[PDB]
From Swiss-Prot:
Residue positions binding Mg(2+): D239, D241, D343, E344, S388
Cofactor(s) needed for function: Mg(2+); Mn(2+)
Occurrences of domain RdRp catalytic (ranges): 235-356
Localisation per UniProt entry: Host cytoplasm, Host perinuclear region
Subunit structure: Homohexamer; also forms fibrous hexameric oligomer. Interacts with the viral genome-linked protein; this interaction induces the multimerization of the RdRp and enhances its activity.
Reported function: Replicates genomic and antigenomic RNA by recognizing replications specific signals. Also transcribes a subgenomic mRNA by initiating RNA synthesis internally on antigenomic RNA. This sgRNA codes for structural proteins. Catalyzes the covalent attachment VPg with viral RNAs.
Origin superkingdom: Viruses
Catalytic activity: RNA(n) + a ribonucleoside 5'-triphosphate = RNA(n+1) + diphosphate
Protein name as annotated: RNA-directed RNA polymerase
Disulfide bonds: C301-C303
Taxonomic placement: Viruses, Riboviria, Orthornavirae, Pisuviricota, Pisoniviricetes
Length: 478
């Protein structure tokens, strides 16, 4: 009956938790029983029952991920720079975004991924209470109540459920120092409220994803060429390649980003209530306890990605303004940015003082990294070729610019397929992957005949195998 107290990974305990145990299974299966090449990526660590190594508990792995959230924040950019940057960003969006209709409860509900958990308190696959058009049963009650609170402009405390990400990782993350990525799973109620509040702004942004630097919702194949052509119109190109972006975020910056989102939403008074709840100290369910996380990015909700990209835009433009002493408006005139959460490409005509720029980013608490992992300033280059975005290398030829998945990544996707959760990643799946096989064919085609022929060979062995010229033409030009 009395609330528990204490510390968990440096963070205060606020209540007992209701989260179900961390998964010990992976969705990844080998496509073949052959042994893996040396240094091959494998699914992330599965805990005490992982037959591959003896490691810590998944709870300890999770505690390791939370430690940076209790670290001190970096500094805010200088107030007059911050205000001018935020004003300039808001003004650009005002000038580009089409005003939207408010989102209905029905649109909010439909927009939700039904294949994921509803989080607190029911922790059930959303599809379990979905009829095709509405939530019913327990989730209907949660969704309706949250909708009523939204319409009343009434606050609700979001409750997040911590998980660890099942994904392919480099082998040193399994056989050396074990790491697995922290995920925040939002409660269905919060998802409904954020979807209603911020769905319109996110739609507006997605429709301008070539004109505006927030690239969320872009299609690599269809929008990439125009996006990268715009970047190519500028002299210098870079990628700061951040470590632990989400956990280094400052809530004071996120609130400035949130202010812009609220102000450009069709229901700003209702949106303000939702944003304030999103950014208030975050209750995170870690199994036995719910803890309070005051800082960093609470990444439960889909609109998270846009908020995070907007923070990124704020921080990048602050550093550039600080260093060049040029107005944010002028910097924008002389630059093309691409942001997707922590992922960026910055192109500019400005001769940036890279030492000072790197210093400024680190000042803000960020952890940019050089390609070579050395301790100096970030590098700038005069060619866009060699820079990545959304895990695709940017490539230019006589036909234009495009994003190409590298050979290691294509090779990796041939080694693994997704299926039901299981304990041993090295099991092959007894026995269909037509659309994914076609995509890999496309991607391989972009690496020329020699590499394509090998990929098509391994792809025939699994399974209609078109000629190189034909698939190349298809994947590049619609």
């Amino acid at each position: 009956l009395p609330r528990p107290s204490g510390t968990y990974a440096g963070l205060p305990i606020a209540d007992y938790g209701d989260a179900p145990p961390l998964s010990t299974k992976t969705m990844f299966w080998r496509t073949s029983p052959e042994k893996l090449p040396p240094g091959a990526w494998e699914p992330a660590y599965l805990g005490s029952k992982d037959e591959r190594v003896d490691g810590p508990s998944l709870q300890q792995v999770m505690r390791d991920q939370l430690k940076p959230y209790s670290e001190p924040r970096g500094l805010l950019p200088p107030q007059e720079i911050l205000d001018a940057v935020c004003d300039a960003i808001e003004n650009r969006l005002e000038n580009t975004l089409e005003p939207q209709k408010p989102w209905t409860f029905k649109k909010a509900c439909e927009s939700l991924d039904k294949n994921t958990s509803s989080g607190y308190p029911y922790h059930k696959q959303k599809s379990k209470d979905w009829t095709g058009s509405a939530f019913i049963g327990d989730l209907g009650d949660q969704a309706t109540h949250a909708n009523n609170m939204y319409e009343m402009g009434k606050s609700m405390r979001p409750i997040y459920t911590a998980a660890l990400k099942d994904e392919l990782v480099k082998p040193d993350k399994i056989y050396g120092k074990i790491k697995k990525r922290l995920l925040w799973g939002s409660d269905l109620g919060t998802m409904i409220r954020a979807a209603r509040a911020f769905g319109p702004f996110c739609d507006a942004l997605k429709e301008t994803c070539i004109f505006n630097p927030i690239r969320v919702g872009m299609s690599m194949n269809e929008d990439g060429p125009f996006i990268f052509a715009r970047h190519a119109n500028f002299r210098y190109h870079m990628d700061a390649d951040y470590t632990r972006w989400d956990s280094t975020q400052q809530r004071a910056i996120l609130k400035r980003a949130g202010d812009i989102m609220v102000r450009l939403s069709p229901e700003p008074d209702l949106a303000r209530v939702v944003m304030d709840d999103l950014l208030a100290p975050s209750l995170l369910d870690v199994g036995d306890y719910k803890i309070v996380v005051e800082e960093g990015l609470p990444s439960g909700c889909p609109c998270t990605t846009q908020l995070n990209s907007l923070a990124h835009w704020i921080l990048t433009l602050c550093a550039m303004v600080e260093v060049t002493r040029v107005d944010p408006d002028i910097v924008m005139q002389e630059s093309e940015f691409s942001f997707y959460g922590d992922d960026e490409v910055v192109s500019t005509n400005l001769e940036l003082d890279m030492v000072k720029y790197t210093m400024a980013l680190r000042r803000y608490g960020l952890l940019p990294t050089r390609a070579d992992k050395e301790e100096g300033p970030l590098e700038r280059r005069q060619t866009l070729q060699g820079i990545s975005f959304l895990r695709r290398a940017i490539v230019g030829d006589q036909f234009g610019w495009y994003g190409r998945l590298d050979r290691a990544s294509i090779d990796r996707q041939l080694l693994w397929t997704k299926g039901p959760n299981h304990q041993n990643p090295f099991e092959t799946l007894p026995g269909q992957r037509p659309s994914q096989l076609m995509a890999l064919l496309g991607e391989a085609a972009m690496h020329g005949e020699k590499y394509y022929r090998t990929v098509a060979s391994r792809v025939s062995k699994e399974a209609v195998v078109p000629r190189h010229r034909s698939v190349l033409r298809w994947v590049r030009f619609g």
